[PDB]
Design a protein around this nucleic acid. Structure first.
Lengths: 229, 230, 229, 230, 227, 229
DNA sequence: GAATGTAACCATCGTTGGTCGGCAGCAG
DNA sequence: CCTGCTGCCGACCAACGATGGTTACATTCC
DNA sequence: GAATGTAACCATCGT
DNA sequence: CGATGGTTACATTCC
């Protein structure tokens, strides 16, 4: 496990040096694109539509099109005009109860390890957040773009570990405009009664090891068959 | 809104025909490269390293490389040997308490709209899930790839809408192997109490329309002033 | 075979779309009356007693009669007041044992064909009904006049088909009030055995091909010979 | 209770005098039409669409319409040629186990009483059919039509009555031509196990008093309040 | 221009990552022993002057001898029981008034440079210290020795810089026992008036550019002729 | 309790003879390394390892690399050029209020005692400086060294004793002018109340008997138990 | 809109590179 | 009854090298 | 195009 | 000798 960000959680007088680790890793098998016959590697070569000429990366300019107003042709100077902020701060804004952030906001997950040997500041914040059950909304800038994020603490056995959840911006969520649910449908009490045993017949507790990506497992063994064959 | 999936939630007798809508959009501005001197669109041409010959898509083949073992080509026919997953039904596995699933599992969210002539099965299924405060661990297959997912219900004002959250497989979560937290630090109640005033001074309820993507807003308005000028 | 009803079996979570087919069709011949001297079809003309003139269907009102009363005028306005639903759902009430419904209750028979992309719900419901040997009591609603009905599964060889039997209401069966059977008559076992032997002498299994409508066949052959001249 | 048909049971050397009653009587309210302005009963007038004149019943004949086979006139000697069907005897043919006759077979039901002061023959026949559970397939003619019928014994407390069930001929029963049920599906034991509780949760015992024609009772109260309302 | 020690100031949940700089560097010319004829640096040899045995490093342990206790040896296992004091944080103990700390205790001074541009905590801590006018007594460890230190902010033009002064332990200051002052000596009130006029005669404000060192200035003049 | 330097204060019309005692002595235990088997005193040998010349104490000549290794030699002529500094008295330059001087140049402290039975001169000098709240800046001439020093008065209990502080030369103070300090960020008023509360929470009074060199104190105990054992 | 690649650049760990230290000799 | 002055030697900061990993983006499939 | 209603007749059990 | 319920066959708002 390698870190991807060495910064600090800062709000006012407070500053907690931490290192960010990616909490999740896609276990899907990733392939490569090769020529069918000679099995050589495949490279992508740019070609301008106007002249059919291969162009280098240095000759590219970002463009924006909106329905009709195509070819805005944004230059790199205009980006420099933007107040770019490649900050190294997890800037805490507020502290909200953990129940006020619903699951559809969460985007990604990251771990927080105390970077320095002085972990007292890290422990105190984690202990305070866990005891009072609050979550901190922060401005987390991973590499070049800033994203809304939430600071939460969860226990991995005997270890109290802080964690960062990238959040979707509130305007990024659509609203269900379905008129079907507006009308009222009458449900007899017996049907509500029946819906009980159906749920409790299949009801259980979340056991992680029951669920296995079957398609990936058989894909892995098929590859191993070719590897030995 | 345009649906992305038309099927049903089936776990036996129960079969609720629903349509899936993408709940979350993305407001980020998406650009596309153009030739600087020509302002012409850029196309990608595939070139094979072995011969330099331009390779059409039909003349491609997936390959997998991992340390020892080179040119491990996976042909199309082997994928056919794998049991295909074209399922158009959201197969329900079991029902778990809403709190038993951890927030780090969710990655994507979708809406469920009833599709049959009568929505009684959908409406009443939502009613019991909220009353029992339970989730539903399901198998969801959007486009030829099955993903573990969770079925839950949210209240959007007056409407009660079922919702699908795709989940990461339990083996996708790493363990925080940090020996630093293992060592124990001595603390006093004075600083422990003092941390209360620091946190509670900034404590507030989650207000959605207080956080804005300022960078996108500035970027968006810069586009228009360039668009009008020429 | 043409469908006479398209709906679904619904009792809560479960909703199995099906098509209803008439399981029995009488094989009689429907004769038409014609003029003796003209061979022309006759159309009945509605003649009112108090008017003596032909009255159209628009000017027709239903009346009820009971003893002293007689002219209880009923118009469709009161019919609208009375709840009347053409619900396209075969609502299920319970699952009684199969043997608990006496054959005197059955009135008509219908077939159920699955009418969905997947017939898993239909097939699995049929499988559990047969293995537990139970019968579902439903509220089958044809074109108005909701009727009590029973749902059962019968094997037509290699196909397992669900069927709907319309039932008369339990209050619709008369009471076999016979004073003669109330009194008892002495009978000796000696001649009881003789009655047993004659009964089993004629015993035979059910062969449906053994019985045919002989009179109707003679009627059948009569009018085709006349038709062919 | 009024007798519909009086006769006997044909057996060769055994005769069982008997009177027939209708086991069921529809309780639906029967309406008859009146003038919308005069409240007068309408009497149908038979007018043929070839002369515009009323026709006495002596001047019509039954005709068979079948495709191009029109103008088929059936006179008095045509239907007299068929043998007379009016018979006052219930001709038994065979004796079949009660489980062999299907529920789909039954059409109507009737009651039988001993139409004499000597009921020994009746109670004798019911006894053999009771202990040796069998059904007697008979030819039953009510007024002028001969229908297949099944004879069984049913008990009302301490009373044993033979009941005659009119059976439609086996050639009037259709065959389900559904290719959908021919194909087989993959089903899991978990799905079958789920079907148990849902069936068993709604499982009960057949109680006749639990079901009432709710529409009829609501309809029934409508006339009387109008009758009592003037 | 080099950070002798990089860490943070922590007094609980607060933590201010800083880098220290030596605030004072002596400008006196320092020499090293050189050979008049050989013109080569002299390297000392670890030779025991009791038996002639030539000794090398990584083989000799510390010793402590005084009065009655002689040849009391200390090895590398005895100091292992001593807890390591190599903590890389400046642990703030209290915040005493900035004026009550006696100038007797200061020996060395240091400069605190902020961390990367994430430096709001430093300016915040400096701002409050100047406002209520207090200094923080801390435990400062440079390499391995933990010394009592006082944290104080002070004004440098338009720049607010926090300085880590180091204090001698309170037990290192001797008690002045001067019996010559035990007797009470009467002071003439007229002399106090006489002294009052005397003190303002030479009352001159401190001008750092008024007085320079003379020994150092003269020595470099002779070096100019040689070079 | 041994005097280190005896002299007088040069004032013109005033001259107070005085003995000087060092105020503070470092209490860290000094260790001398000896042989593991011989326990001898390792006396370093000054033999130049460039030509094998055994340089004597008088043979040594201090050299400085300076700019480009110009290790110029110094003989008795040079020290003759500099004025003799064997004077055993110190002189006063100016009187500055104590508030003007700041403590980053203070390094050492020494006591002073009246050397004559006429102690009235000593106390009179002490009285006026305390009344004037000023510190006299002097040149202190220690063993073959002249340093800038600053008298001062301090009351130890009921005893009145003058004190000499030698100051580091003003030219020896570096300039910490960094652009980061020049760069100013925006401070909200919100955390100022929180920052002040945090500092005031841990505010206390300077009681010198609260801090001991616990590392050094308990090492003596280890030595005490090692010597006893 | 969804998966599925490629191709930029950035970032954290690695490890060779000079100071400034804290620990000891000598001056009648 | 002390104190100035240096190498036996030693932990402290930058400049490129490898390796993940993020971000952006076209190309297929509706 | 069946299912649903309703009137028409004659057979028929009850005196 | 008088009434009831059985087959007739007809006009409807239909998946």
């Amino acid at each position: 496990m390698r870190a991807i960000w060495t910064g600090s959680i800062a709000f006012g007088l407070v500053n907690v040096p931490v290192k960010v680790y990616s909490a999740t890793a896609d276990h899907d098998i990733r392939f490569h694109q090769v020529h069918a016959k000679d099995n050589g590697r495949i490279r992508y070569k740019r070609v301008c539509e106007a002249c059919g000429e291969v162009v280098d990366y240095r000759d590219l300019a970002r463009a924006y099109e909106s329905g009709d107003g195509q070819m805005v042709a944004i230059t790199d100077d205009d980006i420099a005009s933007l107040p770019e902020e490649r900050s190294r701060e997890i800037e805490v804004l507020e502290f909200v109860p953990a129940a006020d952030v619903d699951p559809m906001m969460f985007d990604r997950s990251y771990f927080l390890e105390p970077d320095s040997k002085s972990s007292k500041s890290y422990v105190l914040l984690a202990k305070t957040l866990a005891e009072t059950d609050r979550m901190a909304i922060v401005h987390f800038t991973l590499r070049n773009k800033t994203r809304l994020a939430a600071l939460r603490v969860k226990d991995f056995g005997k270890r109290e570990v802080m964690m960062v959840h990238t959040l979707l911006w509130p305007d990024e969520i659509r609203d269900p405009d379905f008129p079907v649910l507006d009308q009222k449908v009458e449900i007899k009490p017996a049907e509500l009664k029946m819906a009980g045993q159906v749920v409790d017949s299949m009801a259980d507790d979340f056991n992680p090891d029951r669920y296995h990506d079957t398609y990936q497992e058989q894909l892995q063994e098929l590859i191993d068959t070719k590897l030995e064959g």
